[PDB]
Amino acid sequence: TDRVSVGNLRIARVLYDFVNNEALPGTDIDPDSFWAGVDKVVADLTPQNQALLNARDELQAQIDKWHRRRPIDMDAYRQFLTEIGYLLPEPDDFTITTSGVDAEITTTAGPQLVVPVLNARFALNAANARWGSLYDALYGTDVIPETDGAEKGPTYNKVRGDKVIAYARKFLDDSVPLSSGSFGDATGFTVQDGQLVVALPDKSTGLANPGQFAGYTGAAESPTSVLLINHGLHIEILIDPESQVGTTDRAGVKDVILESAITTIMDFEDSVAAVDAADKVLGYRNWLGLNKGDLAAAVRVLNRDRNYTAPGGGQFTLPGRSLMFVRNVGHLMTNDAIVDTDGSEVFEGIMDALFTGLIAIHGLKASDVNGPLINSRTGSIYIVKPKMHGPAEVAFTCELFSRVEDVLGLPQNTMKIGIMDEERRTTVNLKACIKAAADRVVFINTGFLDRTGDEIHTSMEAGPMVRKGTMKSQPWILAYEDHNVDAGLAAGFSGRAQVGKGMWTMTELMADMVETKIAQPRAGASTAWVPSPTAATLHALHYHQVDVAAVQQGLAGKRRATIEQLLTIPLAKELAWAPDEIREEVDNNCQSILGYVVRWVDQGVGASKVPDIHDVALMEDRATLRISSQLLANWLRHGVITSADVRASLERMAPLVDRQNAGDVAYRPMAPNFDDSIAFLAAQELILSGAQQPNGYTEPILHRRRREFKARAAE
Ligand SMILES: O=C(O)c1cc2cc(Cl)sc2[nH]1
Ligand SMILES: [Mg+2]
Ligand SMILES: [Mg+2]
Ligand SMILES: [Mg+2]
């Protein structure tokens, strides 16, 4: 065929081989029984999966027709959504009962990294990013300005280094204050009677709160490092007077190390391009290596844990790696990794649950067959499930997980669930969605891109929508952000599960990140997404300056969003825009699509630093495609713009995207032979067919074009 027959299934040999030879050994699950369970799970769960997808289509069909007869009566609109089953009754108050959850999630607040699992070295970097140098972060980025004269160059600018040092000293004052004086005047550190004691030029002092002293290394009389704790996060003062930086430091300090990326999401969904059996296996194989703890790539090796000395005691170890979640794909797509007897593809999410769940077994244990490094410490498996619509699709995820756990021979509720709030039918039924996963949920979060794509698609027929930039401050999205935090805290998330907020996408603009991203913890988010290990470290500053626990209890019991605000469709007003503004918005959207699409389709890259139309480096996932294509399809549908406008724009934008990828040998230009670039045709189709797509999802077209490209590369 060539495939492996097991019941109604025809399994791609690469997958069959990978599973039996690499993933199964060490798990004590008998191969023939694993494959029987797979057959059974797929046979039993496929019908309901399909039933859900159909229900999505029926609802959207009803809304499309409703809008085609029309301001908007919100009373009648709201009651329509209730009649059809879109808006469901808000259940009574409850508290989640999820148990066996790691410390990283229950108690601590901090940055959360996301990385495409298909890139080993990015995945490895993310795992080791649990601890990072603040000096390197401050020195290498624009947090410390190049004026003056702190300009960066080949040589080490000693002027810049002093700025870094002073910056770090201040942070210490702010986060672990001394009873008198400041770290900036320190001459040394000693450990007397299980207390940190700091040497001043005048006298000496202790911590204003001695309980913030976590541990140390070396002799108590002359420590090689000091370990501090604040708001659950650790701070390490590396002390070494013989160091280059140390010789010039008043107290011999070499560096300050911050606990940064507390948890990481290894991503199988929107940051990766994976359209067939071969791609899935490359992804499963890295997930395997991460869980074994033996993954290593050729630039290297997962960092082992960090050992310290307790204040008045023996040794203790702290986790050196970021706690790994995995984002499986959602309920939509199928993949040829497995087909049935009639040749139709199996649902890709069901597959991920089985395989990523199986592979995750190796991370619950350290052995010669399971590999040396453990992930979860409380025996959990953390799966973020994206793009769910409403509480019934959450319950289906519960059931899927529950069924997988039987096949894997795991205790029930082993497989925990991160509910991404990124679709409108979830937003407005959020409390119900959490309720359906009440014994499994460990995470909710919000974002911009997917949610705004769905916003636009759901109300496609209602009229033209505001510009993408404008969306970020519209009533619905402000309500959506608050209503998430509120639903969460009301379900008892504080001290139990993460409340997360979106990615900082501008990877070179770190000064701005430090200035503004502090808004997310101030809004009571226990975690938020960062695009790099450097960003994780800088964002960790915010959890020191903000007591997320304190903020969360202050927000307790508040109902800051109304259903009316959630349901306020972002229609543009009359007149609204001038020609030049319209063209500018089209260009920006065609550049966004083209810029991301060309690397996805031509090179199978789903996450990278893509310069936007103003050459700013952005790190967005595939959901950039959905928001951009839906906005244009919306503008197209209501005659704000034409198909020829869109094509003229794609043709204008293409050569810029081309020259923006000049430093690439494997890059192939889209201009001037437009109609012969699979990437180009993919970008054009995403728009002109955008309105027909199920909920505006881009994967159907995208996967097919990537398949088409790989097929032409087979000759
Ligand atoms: O929501 C976003 O903008 C966003 C998500 C992800 C995942 C990555 Cl890996 S990079 C990235 N950006
Ligand atoms: Mg998304
Ligand atoms: Mg405090
Ligand atoms: Mg439709």
Domain spans, the chain: 1-130+260-572, 131-259, 573-715
Strand runs labelled E in 446-584: 498-501, 527-530
Ligand 1 atom closest to 531 (CA): 10
Fold type of domain 1-130+260-572: TIM Barrel (3.20.20)
Pocket of ligand 1 (CB under 6 A): 114-116, 267, 271, 447, 449, 502-503, 505, 531, 607, 619-621
Q: How far apart are CA 527 and CA 529, in angstroms?
A: 7
Reduced to 3 states, what is the DSSP secondary structure of residue 7?
coil
Probe residue for ligand 1, chosen from 265, 471, 505 as the CB with the greatest number of ligand atoms within 8 Å: 505
Judge if the upstream peptide bond of residue 672 is cis by omega within 30 degrees of 0: yes
Distance from the alpha carbon of residue 29 to the mean position of ligand 2, in angstroms: 33
Probe residue for ligand 1, chosen from 468, 612, 621 as the CB with the greatest number of ligand atoms within 8 Å: 621
How far does Cα 404 stand from its chain's mean position?
24
Dihedrals phi, psi of 633, to nearest 5 degrees = -65, -35
Resolution of the structure, angstroms: 1.9
Q: How far apart are CA 711 and CA 477, in angstroms?
A: 41
Distance from the alpha carbon of residue 63 to the mean position of ligand 4, in angstroms: 10
Residue 489 CA: distances (Å) to CA of 118, 129, 428:
34, 28, 16
Q: What is the 3-state secondary structure (H, E, C) of 336-354?
A: EEEEECCCCEEEHHHHHHH
Q: How far apart are CA 608 and CA 44, in angstroms?
A: 38
Ligand closest in space to the Cα of 547: 3
Probe residue for ligand 1, chosen from 420, 609, 620 as the CB with the greatest number of ligand atoms within 8 Å: 620
CB within 8 Å of 704: residues ≥ 6 apart: none
Whether residue 384 contacts residue 265, with contact meaning beta carbons closer than 8 Å, is answered with yes
> How many residues are listed for the chain in this entry?
715
* Region label for 217, one of left (φ > 0), alpha (ψ between -120 and 50) or beta (otherwise): beta
CB within 8 Å of 431: residues ≥ 6 apart: 90, 91, 487, 490, 491
Distance from the alpha carbon of residue 390 to the mean position of ligand 3, in angstroms: 37
DSSP state of 64: H
Structure token digits, residue 182 = 């400041």
Q: How far apart are CA 351 and CA 357, in angstroms?
A: 10
Q: Are strands 617-618 and 306-309 parallel, antiparallel or unpaired?
A: unpaired
The one catalytic residue among 56, 327, 403, 622: 327
Distance from the alpha carbon of residue 501 to the mean position of ligand 3, in angstroms: 22
Name which residue sits closest to atom 5 of ligand 1, judged by CA: 621
Q: How was this structure determined?
A: X-ray
Ligand closest in space to the Cα of 529: 1
Name which residue sits closest to atom 1 of ligand 1, judged by CA: 503
Whether residue 386 contacts residue 327, with contact meaning beta carbons closer than 8 Å, is answered with yes
Ligand closest in space to the Cα of 329: 2
Residue 24 CA: distances (Å) to CA of 173, 177, 268:
51, 51, 20
Gaps after which residues in the chain, C–N over 2.5 Å?
70, 299
Structure token digits, residue 497 = 């599960």
What CATH class has 573-715?
Answer: mainly alpha
Q: How far apart are CA 329 and CA 335, in angstroms?
A: 11
Closest by Cα among 123, 408, 415 to 286 = 123
Q: How far apart are CA 630 and CA 640, in angstroms?
A: 14
Q: How far apart are CA 705 and CA 701, in angstroms?
A: 6
626 counts as catalytic: no
Closest by Cα among 330, 329, 347 to 338 = 347
Distance from the alpha carbon of residue 691 to the mean position of ligand 4, in angstroms: 7
Query: Which class for 243: exposed (0-12), middle (13-18), buried (19 or more C-beta within 10 A)?
Result: middle
Residue 553 CA: distances (Å) to CA of 458, 490, 497, 549:
35, 10, 14, 7
327 counts as catalytic: yes
Closest by Cα among 113, 665, 127 to 375 = 127
Q: How far apart are CA 378 and CA 362, in angstroms?
A: 14
Structure token digits, residue 325 = 């979640």
235 DSSP β-pair partners: 228, 258
Name which residue sits closest to atom 6 of ligand 1, judged by CA: 621
Structure token digits, residue 222 = 């002359």
Q: How far apart are CA 423 and CA 455, in angstroms?
A: 8
The one catalytic residue among 249, 270, 602, 621: 621
Q: Which amino acid is at 216?
A: Y
Other beta carbons within 10 Å of 326 = 25
236 DSSP β-pair partners: 227, 257
Reduced to 3 states, what is the DSSP secondary structure of residue 527?
strand
Distance from the alpha carbon of residue 422 to the mean position of ligand 2, in angstroms: 6
Instruction: State whether the Cα torsion 171-176-177-178 is positive or negative.
Output: negative
